[PDB]
Design a binder for this molecule. Structure first.
Ligand SMILES: *C(=N)[C@H]1CN(c2ccc(C(F)(F)F)nc2)C(=O)N1c1cncc2ccccc12
Ligand SMILES: *C(=N)[C@H]1CN(c2ccc(C(F)(F)F)nc2)C(=O)N1c1cncc2ccccc12
Lengths: 300, 300
């Protein structure tokens, strides 16, 4: 009966992690069946990192240019028999299919959605955590050198939903990656160049869920009879760095169980954005937008 | 590079999770070699919860009073051939040794130390998170009905360091369990009786580590030339709900890499405790004591 940042048990994804090496650069890869996905900037030499032509680099590559290694479980050196490019990713074909490939789809997450990340270094998973695709299409994770290729995923039912592969840290401290169709979140460029991300915004539907979790945990000092409509809140949300509140059935279940209307929490969000009264909500003196409405329904 | 709450990859522990059923009650169990550890209150009937004689309950039980089931991976016919009691735990002996038993040690964690938890329900893992053993010998996790038996662990090197098994929820978001020697953290009783935990306290060495992580991430607005000695801070800590600061070599490295003395941060704690002037330290308006000095050195 509490709310903590929770990640899916990584036992499925650990067996899929490999180490792809192309020349002098090496990063992580995802081994599903006879396919190994890895960020395409492993082909780029350090000399041409500012103006790389990945179309020409892919042409200059042969199957022997790449080296895939499996360090976890029973080790195995994978022979690369094919190399292709899909967006900002490499689609390598290996001679051995992963015997532990879980049921998987490739789905792109929207802002506000949360997913688990398996941080890996040299093809060895070291840690796992949960991040939210921020409205500026970035994630607030913990990535070090060589973590490129770490995989973000979900599990709807018995299917692992791959949705993120770590691509780069922007030197602003900003982590970003691409979906498994190659399209980089936020249209960030692979090349090394000055890149500034858009201004971040609070995920309004995640704050409402977090407040519902506090009420379910016996913390409802912030609940007042005052209400602000969803239409009026979205107008206020424009001029104060907040996302448009779009109610879902997951939020409706929290409204019924707690008995607190959504418009009651939208008003409370405005007052809480103007500062707390010194009191804490679930051990936090700040608005927490990292818990989705489905995350709250699950943990309660 | 960032700083987040990070859990160990749960692949090793997922292969050890089983389901223990003693008559009408059912909880999770840890399957290591031929031994299945589980909370001893599974053999207690619902009508004898207020005052159970576990010495008499263990006598009344036989090997067929328990039934262990493996749901994860390849299911197995787990036959119980022996039952013993160790403190607040049951040491069941099964006819099959777990083929995926990792190298494991049993260690009691001290307050302030962090460890990863694999929450399970009916012997099936559902989520993972990291908790710090609070000074009042509780943990602030997210457990639901049927979560008892969930395992807390570390991984030093290639060895899983088991240190926690879930026992009971004391209040909303307040949980406690026992070490794998049987002794329950904080001497909390198994019976359903009034139990009040001690007043919680901030882990001073974890706050110092968390401030060092902010300095390494370019967030050092709180650093001032002022210093308060460890001896003076510990006197203040006694009357302000703080733990005695005992410097380690892990904290010394952060003091060298940042150039900020430990005494400087001890003074900043005594100022930030009163309040953050609307200024965020790594996106937090409160003192975070959930990051150990070893956790900061790893994530930087
Ligand atoms: C990932 N392993 C590294 C390398 N990297 C990177 C960025 C851009 C490009 C190119 F050529 F422009 F396309 N190539 C490589 C990058 O951003 N890295 C990275 C990623 N996440 C975190 C960190 C932390 C520290 C150092 C490097 C990081
Ligand atoms: C864990 N599976 C449940 C059960 N439980 C509990 C059962 C018996 C006894 C006693 F007194 F020893 F006999 N004590 C405790 C308990 O505390 N549970 C539990 C644990 N964590 C979280 C929750 C949340 C909701 C309901 C029960 C929880």
């Amino acid at each position: 009966s509490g709310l903590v940042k929770m990640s899916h048990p990584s036992g499925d994804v650990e067996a899929c992690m490999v180490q792809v090496t192309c020349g002098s650069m090496t990063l992580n890869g995802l081994w599903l069946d006879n396919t190994v996905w890895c960020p395409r900037h492993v082909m780029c030499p350090a000399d041409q990192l500012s103006d790389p032509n990945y179309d020409a680099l892919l042409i200059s590559m042969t199957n022997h240019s790449f080296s895939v290694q499996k360090h976890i479980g029973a080790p195995a050196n994978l022979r690369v028999v094919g190399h292709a490019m899909q967006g900002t990713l490499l689609k390598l074909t290996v001679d051995v299919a992963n015997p532990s490939t879980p049921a998987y789809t490739f789905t792109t997450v929207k802002p506000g959605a949360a997913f688990s990340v398996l941080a890996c270094y040299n093809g060895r998973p070291t840690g796992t955590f949960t991040v939210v695709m921020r409205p500026n299409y970035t994630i607030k994770g913990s990535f070090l050198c060589g973590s490129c290729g770490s995989v973000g995923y979900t599990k709807e039912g018995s299917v692992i939903n791959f949705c993120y592969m770590h691509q780069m840290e922007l030197a602003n401290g900003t982590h970003t990656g691409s979906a498994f169709d190659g399209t980089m979140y936020g249209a960030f460029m692979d090349k090394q160049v000055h890149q500034v991300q858009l201004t971040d915004k609070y995920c309004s539907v995640n704050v409402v869920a977090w407040l519902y979790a506090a009420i379910l945990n016996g913390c409802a000092w912030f609940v007042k009879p005052n209400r602000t409509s969803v239409v009026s809140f979205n107008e206020w949300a424009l001029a104060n760095q907040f996302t448009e509140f779009v109610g879902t059935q997951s939020v409706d279940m929290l409204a019924v169980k707690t008995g607190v209307a959504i418009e009651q929490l939208l008003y409370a969000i405005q007052q809480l954005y103007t500062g707390f009264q010194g009191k804490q909500i679930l051990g936090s003196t700040m608005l927490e937008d990292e818990f989705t409405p489905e995350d709250v329904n699950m943990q309660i």
